[PDB]
């Protein structure tokens, strides 16, 4: 509970063409249109994902993702090693530097080679990500109720970057701390 609220801004260099970022870089929604997004090496081309601008190399840090799934979409939240594969079919799993949870209506899972289905007391509106770089914890909780969701144990050898994904029109997320 000594996790330091962090500023997150979504990096428009990284965002899949199917994600629309807000002017303030605090929100994203799944867009009906592929944008004519410059295909620079930092940009996801298949995974409908976006990174934060600023990575973490130490300490304890925490941020909150508010999730709105209007019509059976999904949202993915977590952290990636900064050398995560961005081009092609990415497998979201620890082995490939992804520590993330996927939320849909009636469906939450921790992503790995062997995804873990999680049944919660409530459908999370808000997911708190609490990262302890020093120990190697990625903790997910319901940011309103503090209900535990999942904890990954990780060995960080590189910078880690807050990670977000959306699938399906009417799906969106917004950031706070």
Author numbering: 305 to 481
What text comes from the article?
The tripartite motif (TRIM) proteins form one of the largest subfamilies of RING-type E3 ubiquitin ligases, comprising more than 80 members. TRIM family members typically contain a RING domain usually catalyzing ubiquitin transfer; one or two B-box domains mediating protein–protein interactions; and a large coiled-coil domain region, which is involved in self-association or oligomerization with other TRIM E3-ligase proteins. About two-thirds of human TRIM proteins feature a PRYSPRY domain, also known as the B30.2 domain, in their C-terminal region. All characterized family members shared the same overall PRYSPRY twisted β-sandwich fold consisting of a 7-stranded and a 6-stranded antiparallel β-sheet.
